[PDB]
Design a protein around this ligand. Sequence first.
Ligand code: TSV
Ligand code: ZN
Lengths: 191, 195
Amino acid sequence: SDEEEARELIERAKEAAERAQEAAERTGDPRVRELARELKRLAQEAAEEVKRDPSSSDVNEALKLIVEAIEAAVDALEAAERTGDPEVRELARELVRLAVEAAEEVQRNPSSSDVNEALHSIVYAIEAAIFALEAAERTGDPEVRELARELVRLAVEAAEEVQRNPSSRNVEHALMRIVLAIYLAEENLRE
Amino acid sequence: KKGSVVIVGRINLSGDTAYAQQTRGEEGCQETSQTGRDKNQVEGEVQIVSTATQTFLATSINGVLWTVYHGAGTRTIASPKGPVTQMYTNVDKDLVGWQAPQGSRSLTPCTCGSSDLYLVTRHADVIPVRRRGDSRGSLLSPRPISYLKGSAGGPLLCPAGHAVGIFRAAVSTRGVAKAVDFIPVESLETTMRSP
Ligand SMILES: CC(C)(C)OC(=O)N[C@H]1CCCCC/C=C\[C@@H]2C[C@@]2(C(=O)NS(=O)(=O)C2CC2)NC(=O)[C@@H]2C[C@@H](OC(=O)n3cc4cccc(F)c4c3)CN2C1=O
Ligand SMILES: [Zn+2]
């Protein structure tokens, strides 16, 4: 309602922090550990910045996006962990890395629409990647795997160009095209 | 070889809350799909629709019956006068439309700008959704995907029962949906003429 929304966001941040911690411990990988620690760090810094401005309706929306980003990035990390192909894994980790960077940029400059759009695009891409990675693992299918690879590669490519030039055009249609292809491939396997 | 999409039921929205009816069984469906010829009377704003492998929803808005591409593909719809070709086909929006069948009524697009939405399922459940952006809404509680599956093409309604969008996808992790993706009513792009 009022400050009930600020407390709700703190509680999401702390659970996101815990899930990140659990991912840091579960994995036998120093590359994942460090990403998971960075996600926990951003979760705790988001929780602390809400506590500085508890009755502030303004900046609490940029921090809502950061908490969303973290939750989705942790999901992506968990999905990467259950992914058989190291190439896809590496691509998934790179998307999470780019999400961390985009989240830091939002936190350092919460009123910039360019910086907020870049994070939004990465979160959008991560949600598409989670669907793709989860379909690859559920089906065990090589074609679904290659489509999942294509999707994450595309997402990484887009985020890195948007870093260089903020204007650089969005891959939303191109990502959804692969989602559909994955979906139909999975449906054809039911037969 | 590919048959028509067949109306196998409907959902009435003009009563207090949603009410669904079955109008066709499995056998009648497959025969109707082959001929593209369906002489059943159509009523209501939401149609329950079938291909040989999937069942889903279609919603009438602005004299067009809209559904998801990922269900209907490029198929014709069975009608009293034989198979009717799509008027709109947009794979990038996951959107298709045929001219609304005789006897259907359209929903009015939302003008109120409310964020309290309601997603109508194939079984006539009504699930609250908090609008976030143009084409996304949060669920109030996490929901197993099986409660949503088969409801794409269905309406998201405002508190006044106007159409806000068409249900398209479930944002989900490990079979648990937290949010929904819908085609906004503003994206239901029509043209005055057709070649
Ligand atoms: C978008 C994001 C975040 C990556 O997530 C997901 O892709 N999630 C999945 C989760 C799947 C599990 C079931 C969830 C339950 C119900 C879902 C409503 C439903 C359905 O009931 N279909 S149906 O059985 O009636 C069927 C008979 C009609 N849709 C689906 O399955 C669709 C289909 C497919 O999506 C697309 O091909 N495109 C093409 C697009 C183009 C533009 C924009 C888009 F968004 C597009 C989405 C994946 N789908 C999801 O939802
Ligand atoms: Zn309205």
